[PDB]
UniProtKB/Swiss-Prot annotation, chain A:
It comes from Homo sapiens. Disulfide bonds join 15-82. Expressed not only by natural killer (NK) cells but also by T-cell subsets, B-cells, dendritic cells, mast cells, granulocytes and monocytes. This is CMRF35-like molecule 8. GO terms for cellular component: extracellular exosome; ficolin-1-rich granule membrane; membrane; plasma membrane; tertiary granule membrane. Upon tyrosine-phosphorylation, interacts with PTN6/SHP-1 and PTPN11/SHP-2 and INPP5D. Residues 1-102 form the Ig-like V-type domain. It is found in: Cell membrane. It comes from the Eukaryota. Residues 1-104 are extracellular. One of its GO terms (biological process) is negative regulation of B cell proliferation. Glycans are attached at residues 62, 71. The lineage of its organism: Eukaryota, Metazoa, Chordata, Craniata, Vertebrata.
Length: 106, 107, 107
């Protein structure tokens, strides 16, 4: 998926998932070179739900979660994964929506 | 996931998988390293279902398979992979569930 | 594991429900205060030497519904506290993460 916002602006991405995933850890990360991606925020694991300009909120009742990036900078752009964390060692084998972030001039 | 048992005792470990994997070879292997992980037991592969004190049994109805260790020894402890042998290209290799096996004193 | 609080009145028959997943279906299901060291003292269990019924405690597995139930009769203040809705391999004493960590509160 592709999403775009202006520098200084904000963006949110909604990522859907299936009913059995309601209670699983939900996360946001860049695609890794190792099995585990470096989770920027997550709903249940140790990254925390908020880290600086990035936050994550799960809405099981709608079968989706939303990642929000505040005060965008050019560095925020790029490929990300929004994932639901399943038993697999590698996050690649989770249900993942790939999200491509663009950041344009304000 | 960690499963543990006493020296001389037994344990079994469950390894979940996806519906797509029901018909695939399942395995149990040590070291957790791609290519170097040697399959101790497999459900279809030539390692066989039982290799000494270890066996494997698949239950596609519960989307998991179970590895059993008997007569545990200290050397049985370590990190293992429960693996699904997927016959297609994967950028991060076969899907695996990582299991820490621990052995505690025999009571 | 998952966390559940189960509350009921003193002298009541308290019904603790412990859901689980498909991988746990065939496992022994148990009730116990969490382990002092490695393993807990199984109060009741569905597939073990402990028995499904002992004193005011009894257990019933409902694998079709991916849940088991522990019933506490004649609930007292001393019953409050932390417990494991535990799982292990039938007829043996191995360590698995419990499926539910239960807090019993008595009012």
């Amino acid at each position: 998926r592709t999403v775009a916002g202006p520098v200084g602006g904000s963006l949110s991405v909604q990522c859907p998932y299936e009913k059995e995933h309601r209670t699983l850890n939900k996360y946001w990360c860049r695609p890794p070179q190792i099995f585990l991606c470096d989770k920027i925020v997550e709903t249940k694991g140790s990254a925390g739900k908020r880290n600086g300009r990035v936050s994550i909120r799960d809405s099981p009742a709608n079968l989706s979660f939303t990642v929000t990036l505040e005060n965008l900078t050019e560095e925020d752009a790029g490929t990300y994964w929004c994932g639901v964390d399943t038993p697999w060692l590698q996050d690649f084998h989770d249900p993942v929506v790939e999200v491509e972030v663009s950041v344009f001039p304000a």
